[PDB]
Structure formats: C-alpha cells, structure tokens
Amino acid sequence: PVLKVMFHKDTNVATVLDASGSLSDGSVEVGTFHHPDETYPDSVTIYHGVRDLLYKRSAKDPSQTASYPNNIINMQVISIDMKATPRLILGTALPRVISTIEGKDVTWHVDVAGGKAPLTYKWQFKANTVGAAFADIDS
C-alpha cells in the first residue's frame, strides 16, 4: 500500500498516514512510499522510507528541496507518529505438504494478524489434472 508522510517544522514530528487521509495541524506533504517494498519486502521498515524521503527536502522550509549540506539528516530529534493501518502479516502459515489416506478428515488452520477489521477469508482449490485453475469452494 502507498503511505503518505507529513512533516511539522516546529515540533519536528513526522506523521505517516494513508493516501486518502489528511492532516490540518499545519504540516506539509513531503512524499509517498510503499511500506511493503516491491523488491525488498522484509528488508526496510517505515524508518528507512521516512529517512529517504526527508533526505530530499530543505532545512529552512520543508516545502522546497535542497542539496546535501542543507537537508534534514538528523533523525535523533525527529519523532515518527504512525496513523496508518498496521501492515498485514501471516502469524501462522499452512503446512506445505499434508499426507493422508482415503477416508480420513483433514483440517487447515491459518492465523492473520494486523490490518483493518473485519477480515474476510476465501478458500480456493486447484485440481491435480493438467490445465487446471483455481476455483472457489462452494461456501
């Protein structure tokens, strides 16, 4: 998902919030980024994206851009405030292979944490024959 970052000069508080959301505190819009990175999903968190976005902007006025000696590169004073929905993670994963014999019951359980409630689950089944595609199980 795309996240939107706003920066307040006086209090040095950076707000991370959804694309549709907005803030009327008096902050300015610095940029946007994808929280789950497309190429490196489990490599970088929100902090790295916020730092990379803030590297571009100017120290005097966060509205405009500046070169190296004049950016906002001191992250010790800057505080990150999170307002966006937490990312969706898979706490429990299905076993990769299940072996059984004919005439026995089998059970699959999955647990998902995070996201915005409520959550909806849909199950799909693909036949073993050649040229088969996923089809919904009749609920």
Binding site: T39, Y40, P41, D42, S43, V44, H48
Partner: protein, 51 residues
Amino acid sequence: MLNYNAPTDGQKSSIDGANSDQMQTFFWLKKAIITARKEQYFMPLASVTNM
C-alpha cells in the same frame, strides 16, 4: 538494507542477476532420522519342531 533478500521463497539478492541464482542456499547435516524395529512378543513363545 537486505540486498541479500532471501534466495529461497523466490526473492533475488541484489548482486545476483535476473538469470543466475545463489549456488548454495542451505546446509545439509548428512545425518538421517531412522526408526527402530518393532519388537516381537509371540515369537519367543513358539517351540520349534524339526521337519
């Protein structure tokens, strides 16, 4: 800054190109898990008769 990513699960490290991949991505202990033989109870009871 994981330019290593995870070669397993389909992710590619940054140094490796789109075509190539890491030669070795796991460690093999070479020590196998085996189960013991089932024990027998009725066999010691029998008394043998020569044919």
